[PDB]
């Protein structure tokens, strides 16, 4: 039962975290890149620097590793495979992280209420600031939910340890790119 | 209208997603504990006046030093967690947690937080403690923890039984207006 809940909440959490991407390019990054609102001189053509890579996120995790986590959901003790065939696409967490700073300063000295503006008018509870941290609030928590599967899967399991060992190195690796 | 934006830090021993949780379903979650707290705002009344809370969990990230405080800048209020029934997480208030969220913002309110009341008084985790040579963490302790961090204030909750638990997020509010 257990390792149930866990592959059900891994699931769940995954298609929120793709809707929040997903919300996120098409009201904050859409508004800009619309040219239907009049945006700050000091961030035009800069949304490269405020969202970074994260189409490429969301492109990955819509078009693939959603589909593939969910044909897992009855192998939960396998599912740390699926993260291994996938190792090279989590490199782009690296990139995201390194920007984040720079999106974070430019968000603050340049964009005055331009977003506030946006939420305010779409009604969303999340601030841009909240859609923006959660590649990194995602990237660290798959090696969490790797860490209860251990906890509940036999010696059929090292299809979660070379799993894990993969979602321990992104992070870290994203973590030593820092300045 | 007022928005507020809390950030939870600690380490993995506080159960920091299962008080964020058990804060915001009003129950703590019993049969499966997730894992998974997503960034949370809801609007709330404190001393009449209606404010949106924003929730921010940080799980995960422990191991991180420099991912972490990409979720620092503009914090509001600070919950500085550790559990009650592990001594290493509350000296590590001092020695990681509070150094870190000074460091990157200086001037934000942290209101001290120690989780696990349910367990300070209970026989199998007093023994498992008293077998390494420790005991509970008591109160005198966390009121002098959190003046020489600067806290605005020391509170003691249980995501268990719920003891303490509104009134930790009603003071991390009225430490913002
Ligand atoms: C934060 C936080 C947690 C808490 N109290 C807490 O965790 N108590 C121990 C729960 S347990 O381990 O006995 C248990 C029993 C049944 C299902 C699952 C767990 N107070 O603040």
Known sequence: ?179 | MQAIKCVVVGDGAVGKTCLLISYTTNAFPGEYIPTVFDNYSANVMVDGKPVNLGLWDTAGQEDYDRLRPLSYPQTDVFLICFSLVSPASFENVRAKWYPEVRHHCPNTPIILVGTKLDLRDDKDTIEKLKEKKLTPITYPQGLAMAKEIGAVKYLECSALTQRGLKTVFDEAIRAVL
């Open chain 1, 1 to 179: 039962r257990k390792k149930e809940f866990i592959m059900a909440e891994l699931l769940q959490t995954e298609k929120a975290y793709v809707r929040d991407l997903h919300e996120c390019l098409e009201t904050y990054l859409w508004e800009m890149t619309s040219g239907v609102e009049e945006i700050p001189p000091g961030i035009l053509n800069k949304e490269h620097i405020i969202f970074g890579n994260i189409q490429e996120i969301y492109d990955f995790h819509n078009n693939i590793f959603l589909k593939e986590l969910e044909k897992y959901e009855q192998l939960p003790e396998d599912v740390g495979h699926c993260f291994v065939t996938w190792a090279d696409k989590f490199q782009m967490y690296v990139t995201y992280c390194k920007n984040k700073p720079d999106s974070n300063q430019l968000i603050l000295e340049h964009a005055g209420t331009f977003f506030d503006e946006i939420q305010q008018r779409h009604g969303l509870a999340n601030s841009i600031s909240s859609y923006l941290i959660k590649p990194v609030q995602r990237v660290t928590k798959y090696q969490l939910l790797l860490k209860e599967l251990l906890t509940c899967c036999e010696e059929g399991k090292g299809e979660l340890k070379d799993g894990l060992e993969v979602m321990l190195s992104v992070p870290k690796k994203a973590n030593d790119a820092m300045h």
